[PDB]
Design a protein around this nucleic acid. Structure first.
Ligand SMILES: [Zn+2]
Ligand SMILES: [Zn+2]
Lengths: 167, 96, 116, 119, 209, 144, 128, 40, 179
DNA sequence: AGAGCGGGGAGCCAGCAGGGAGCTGG
RNA sequence: GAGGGAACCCACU
DNA sequence: CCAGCTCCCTGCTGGCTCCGAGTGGGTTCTGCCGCTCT
């Protein structure tokens, strides 16, 4: 839950920031800059198109993906020859759907008491920590890796190197 | 105690350091089983495919599929191994 | 004894050993620029194959602050008389042949390190 | 076997933090930058690593680690999940704020006494 | 050193003449068991000085059944062996009308010299032996069982008894150390007598390939 | 001094009859003689055999290839049998002799050391279908 | 403990285990009390000196053992006994630490701006 | 002596390895050389 | 002198000097920064025919791609030099036996990518893909046309179905690169 | 407009460069 | 009186 | 006299093929969204 909350609150916005703005010339120049993300609560749109607050049992039963729409604020500036810069503020532009970990901050079961969870046909003993993808509960197994930014010196065997430092 | 000698019995119960060191010891046996199965099976397969057509012929010789003589008699005595027994030579050991 | 790197002054590079037969002596010459200098020590290169018998000079006194090191009060400091001292084995790759204990005085401002 | 592992019950994997408060505090807690020092001062001083970045050296590493532990223990500038390691023999202080570090809570002992009291 | 080289020369001569007795050549019992002192008395003590000279160490033997079937054992002084030494040795063989020789080299032979040996093998049979290989008798080792070279009539009786072809027998390489010891060519059959854990004695037959 | 391929030599006096010098006395008993024996960490068998006061009969290696190149094919057959027996009977396990003898005779029937691998088995005169059944199926059938 | 101890050593080892038990020394001279006070830590010395004031002018050299352990880069100036220097630098360092805490909390949270995700509640028809 | 046994030695045997893990000799001595430790 | 000051912090230590002697002897023939950058760029991914192109490529490797954590911006080369000298110093310490070799199985040398970092890696790749497709669409409608609609430029299927696919299958990457 | 379709190791082998005798030629 | 394959994961002896 | 040049041994590097047997159960994806043309 803590890793998913850090990903949603901090990592998505940081990834959007570190992506460079798009500079496009044929001539007219267009600069696209993605500014501020917005994440909603997990909503379902049927074929009618009316949004609804999508519950985890609805996602499990109807084989839905328990995902929340991710909007973003985009600025499009126009740079012509002999013309000032033109600003277009495309506020809250939908760019996809982020699957939501159960009982995380942006899950609809967040902050609910056990009575509210039982009224929603959820088990209060259920830990969360998983996603609902096409109605199937998916857990992300943690993955070990070597630590970054650290100097590690080993001795490669049966090689041309007596010792090797790695970072 | 530091380097993994467990001074307790299973009835007495292990200290936490002894418990962790015993887990380190038993993980070795689990690893040994799991990684020895594949190499042993490959050894068995290679041993089988090297000798599968070697057989006792009707002239009591041991030959392969190429009909080359491997042994002139099976086990050098021509006897099946499911009926020989451990016995003692009476005249080998005693003095003159 | 060991020989160290002697550096040039014009370009601060490495001086390499060389001889002059007109003076018939030894000089450290820089071969990036044209600097030359008469060499003080005749020893150009030395092996220390079995000269790893000492490990006290690599020990620092800061290990007196290590809480994971064993402390004893039966080995008083010779330099200052403090009763307590940490002891440890050598941490080198040369310590495979020796479990010899080294001692460091745990009194501040002393840092005296000795053996047995 | 051995490759798939499980968490211990009180094990917590760190979530990550920004090094900026620790870096600012180190800058005005008598640590001198690498850009402003001659190399001759590096031999006797303690190298300071923040998320594996050598940011400077310190002349008094013991009181620096005491100060850093005091800051982390009262949940000041340093947050609780930050790891601070003093390699005493190698004269290094490594501060890690990144994610993925697995840690566990331990009771603090000062002078052979628990800081956990009956209160 | 002169003493260790004299010991080497005595050991080489003893192994050579054990080999010659094993090959069927007439080597008398007096010169099988020649002691180091007897070798010192007959030949010398200081090979670097030259009292035992390798050229003087040349052994001429005659086969037991055929007294005109003689074989040489040559000891080149030079460590390698070239074409010139081979030409000198085969000229000596031609002028003494002998078709078999052993060449006990110190370091080895040049590849051209081995090519000359295999080229002249139809007329004169010349065997390469390192001194290192000949410093012991490998047939006296406990791992090496008894090898007996079979006559052609024995081979035909063997193949008639077991109704075999030659390629159905087990094989031994012509470069095998025991095969090189007995000086056997391709097509011959060696009868191996060995002890058996189960039967007591077992006889194998190996064709030279 | 010494021989280049041999790094370390371990002297020991064996207390067990596995590596002793059994002799038949004048009375006629089998008497075990405790005699000092050496072990090596490298293999230079021919030089060791040539050395002074080294037994040129009982001295042996555990290297199969050098025993084959020094003493021949029947000697490496016996050495292979001894080493396989050592591996089997380390645990006190017993396998009947005919199985070990058949494996060693299979590995030494063609004059050289035929390894129990594709490079030993698939280079015999056996049919292409047997070879492709073992290993390198497509390559064997293309060679055929 | 395979050691023999006379009365001095017995009393000072017991008291060297429980320094904290001392409230008021009575009338012991420092020259007697010299061992147990050298194996001690400066807060306990402040406690002892503020219950047993008559020891103060005796213990100042003792403070040097603390000063070169806590302020090893320093030296006293003139008209500075080691106790008053240790207390002045100790309180100055605590005040510097408190000012730094109130800086890097105020100037990192309240002063600058950090960007994160905000809740939408849009329910947009951009995904129909 | 660190002589290898078990499955790795069986693999080193049935695969004719030119590089055994622990190659070794068992050197036996002749005469008085075998009887005293100094000439051994 | 400067290189050894960055590598060897105590110049009164002769064995570190002895071990850095072969590297100094090997690299004596290069004596300028531009010649060294040329030597680096001669062994690049694609060596440029222009020497100045090789200088730019070597500078880009040494700044952007060599030790990004100590510094990636311009004029941050002294921190990178101290860190590289620290790596060489650690290598010499291991060579002397003065410092123990690192342990791969030591679990303080390991980090655990949880749902956060893994989803961040996914979303970084897929936001790069979404910006790539937006760039292609807007490039097409500024090349022949004059204007492009941004709402039609964004393919939400990229982020949505990529996250859905990687969470559904467990293959952590792209759909066309599952192997 | 809208229906349907084209675009990790471990151990073998051979193939190359480096060596080092040795015949023909002056 | 019997119409998919493939990939991956978990598990069993 | 003595320089010249060709063809077999060793060694390094690259390719290449192998890595236990047998069982349950699951999910996902194959098979894709731009069209040019009436
Ligand atoms: Zn210079
Ligand atoms: Zn002291």
């Amino acid at each position: 839950l803590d890793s998913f909350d850090e990903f949603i609150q901090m990592s998505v916005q940081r990834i959007v920031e570190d992506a460079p703005p798009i500079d496009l010339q044929a001539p007219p120049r267009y600069l696209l800059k993605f500014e501020q993300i917005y994440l909603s609560k997990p909503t379902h749109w049927e074929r009618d198109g009316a949004p609804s607050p999508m519950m985890p049992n609805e996602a499990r039963l109807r084989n839905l993906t328990y995902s929340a729409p991710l909007y973003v604020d985009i600025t499009k500036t126009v740079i012509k020859e002999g013309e000032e810069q033109l600003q277009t503020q495309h506020q809250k532009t939908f760019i996809g759907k982020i699957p939501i970990m159960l009982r995380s901050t942006y899950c609809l079961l967040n902050g609910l008491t056990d009575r509210d969870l039982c009224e929603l046909n959820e088990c209060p003993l259920d830990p969360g920590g998983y996603f609902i993808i096409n109605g199937s509960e998916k857990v992300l197994i943690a993955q070990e890796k070597m630590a970054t930014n650290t100097v590690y010196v080993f001795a490669k065997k049966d090689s041309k190197y007596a010792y090797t430092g790695e970072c | 105690e530091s380097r993994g000698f467990v001074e307790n019995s299973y009835l007495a119960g292990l200290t936490p350091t002894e418990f962790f060191f015993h887990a380190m010891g038993g993980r070795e046996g689990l690893i040994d089983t799991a990684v020895k199965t594949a190499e042993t099976g490959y050894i068995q397969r290679r041993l089988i495919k090297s000798m599968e057509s070697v057989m006792v012929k009707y002239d009591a010789t041991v030959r392969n599929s190429i009909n080359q003589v491997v042994q002139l008699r099976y086990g050098e005595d021509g006897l099946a191994g499911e009926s020989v027994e451990f016995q003692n030579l009476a005249t080998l050991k005693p003095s003159n | 004894g060991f020989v160290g790197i002697r550096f040039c002054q014009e370009c601060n590079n490495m001086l390499y050993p060389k001889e002059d037969k007109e003076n018939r002596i030894l000089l450290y010459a820089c071969r990036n620029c044209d600097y030359q200098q008469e060499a003080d020590n005749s020893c150009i290169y030395v092996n220390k194959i079995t000269h790893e018998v000492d490990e006290l000079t690599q020990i620092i006194a800061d290990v007196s602050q290590d809480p994971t090191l064993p402390r004893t009060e039966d080995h008083p400091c010779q330099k200052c008389g403090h009763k307590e001292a940490v002891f440890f084995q050598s941490h080198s790759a040369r310590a495979e042949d020796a479990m010899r204990l080294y001692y460091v005085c745990t009194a501040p401002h002393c840092g005296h390190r000795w053996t047995e | 076997v051995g490759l798939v592992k499980n968490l211990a019950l009180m094990a917590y994997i760190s979530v990550g933090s920004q090094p900026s408060p620790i870096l600012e505090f180190l800058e005005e807690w008598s640590m001198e930058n690498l850009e402003e020092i001659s190399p001759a001062a590096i031999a006797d001083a303690t190298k300071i690593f923040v998320n594996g970045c050598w940011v400077g050296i310190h002349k008094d590493p013991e009181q620096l680690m005491n100060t850093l532990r005091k800051l982390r223990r009262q949940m000041d500038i340093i947050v609780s999940e930050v790891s601070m390691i003093r390699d005493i023999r190698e004269r290094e202080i490594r501060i890690y704020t990144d994610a993925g570090r697995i840690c566990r809570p331990l009771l603090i002992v000062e002078k052979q006494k628990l800081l956990l009291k009956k209160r | 050193d002169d003493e260790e080289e004299t010991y080497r020369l005595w050991k080489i001569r003893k192994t050579i003449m054990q080999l010659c007795h094993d090959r069927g050549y007439l080597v008398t019992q007096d010169e099988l068991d020649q002691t180091l002192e007897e070798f010192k008395a007959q030949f010398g003590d200081k090979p670097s000085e030259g009292r035992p000279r390798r050229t003087d160490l040349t052994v001429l033997v005659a086969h037991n059944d055929d007294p005109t079937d003689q074989m040489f054992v040559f000891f080149p002084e030079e460590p390698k062996v070239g074409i010139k030494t081979i030409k000198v040795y085969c000229q000596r063989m031609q002028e003494e009308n002998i078709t078999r020789a052993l060449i006990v080299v110190q370091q080895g032979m040049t590849p051209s010299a081995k090519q000359s040996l295999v080229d002249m093998a139809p007329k004169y049979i010349l065997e390469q032996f390192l001194q290192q290989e000949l410093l012991i008798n490998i047939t006296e080792h406990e791992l090496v069982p008894e090898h007996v070279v079979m006559t052609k009539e024995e081979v035909t009786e063997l193949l008639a008894r077991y109704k075999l072809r030659e390629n159905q027998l087990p094989r031994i390489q012509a470069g095998d150390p025991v095969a090189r010891y007995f000086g056997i060519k391709r097509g011959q059959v060696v009868k191996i007598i060995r002890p058996s854990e189960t039967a007591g004695r077992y006889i194998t037959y190996r064709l030279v390939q | 001094q010494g021989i280049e391929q041999i790094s370390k030599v371990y002297m020991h006096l064996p207390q067990t009859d596995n590596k002793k010098k059994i002799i038949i006395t004048e009375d006629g008993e089998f008497k075990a003689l405790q005699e000092w024996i050496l072990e090596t960490d490298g293999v230079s068998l021919m030089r060791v055999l040539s050395e002074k006061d080294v037994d040129p009969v009982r001295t042996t290696s555990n290297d199969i290839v050098e025993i084959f190149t020094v003493l021949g094919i029947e000697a490496v057959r016996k050495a292979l049998e001894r080493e396989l027996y050592h591996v089997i009977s380390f645990d006190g396990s017993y396998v009947n002799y005919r199985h070990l003898a058949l494996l060693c005779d299979t590995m030494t029937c063609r004059g050289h050391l035929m390894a129990i691998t594709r490079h030993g088995v698939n280079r015999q005169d056996t049919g292409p279908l047997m070879k492709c059944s073992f290993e390198e199926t497509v390559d064997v059938l293309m060679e055929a | 403990l395979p050691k023999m101890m006379t009365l001095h050593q017995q009393c000072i080892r017991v008291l060297k285990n429980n320094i904290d038990s001392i409230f008021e020394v009575g009338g012991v001279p420092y020259s007697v009390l010299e061992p147990v006070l050298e194996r001690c830590t400066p807060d306990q010395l402040y406690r002892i000196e503020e219950y047993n004031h008559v020891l103060i002018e005796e213990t100042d050299q003792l403070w040097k053992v603390h000063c070169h352990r806590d302020f090893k880069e320093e030296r006293p100036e003139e008209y500075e006994s080691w106790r008053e220097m240790y207390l002045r630098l100790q309180d100055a360092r605590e005040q510097r630490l408190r000012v730094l805490t109130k800086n890097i909390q105020f100037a990192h949270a309240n002063k600058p701006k950090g960007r994160q995700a905000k809740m939408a509640f849009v329910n947009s028809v951009a995904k129909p | 002596k660190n002589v290898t046994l078990g499955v790795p030695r069986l693999k080193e045997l049935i695969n004719i390895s030119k590089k055994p893990k622990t190659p070794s000799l068992t050197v036996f001595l002749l005469g008085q050389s075998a009887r005293d430790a100094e000439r051994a | 002198r400067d290189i050894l000051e960055h590598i060897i912090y105590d110049f009164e230590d002769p064995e570190m000097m002895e071990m850095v002697k072969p590297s100094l002897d090997e690299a004596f023939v290069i004596q300028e920064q531009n010649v060294a950058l040329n030597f680096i760029g001669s062994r690049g991914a694609k060596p440029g025919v222009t020497k100045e192109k090789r200088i730019k490529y070597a500078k880009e490797v040494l700044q952007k791609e060599m030790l990004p954590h100590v510094g990636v911006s311009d004029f941050c080369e002294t921190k990178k030099a101290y860190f590289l000298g620290y790596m060489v110093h650690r290598l010499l310490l291991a060579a002397l036996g003065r410092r123990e070799l690192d342990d791969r199985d030591h679990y303080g040398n390991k980090r655990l990518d949880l749902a956060g970092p893994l989803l961040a890696f996914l979303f970084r790749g897929m936001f790069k893909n979404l910006l790539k497709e937006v760039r292609i669409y807007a490039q097409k409608f500024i090349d022949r046309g004059k204007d492009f609609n941004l709402e039609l430029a964004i393919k939400t299927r990229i982020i949505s179905d990529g996250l859905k696919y990687s969470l559904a299958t467990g293959n952590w990457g792209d759909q066309k690169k599952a192997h």
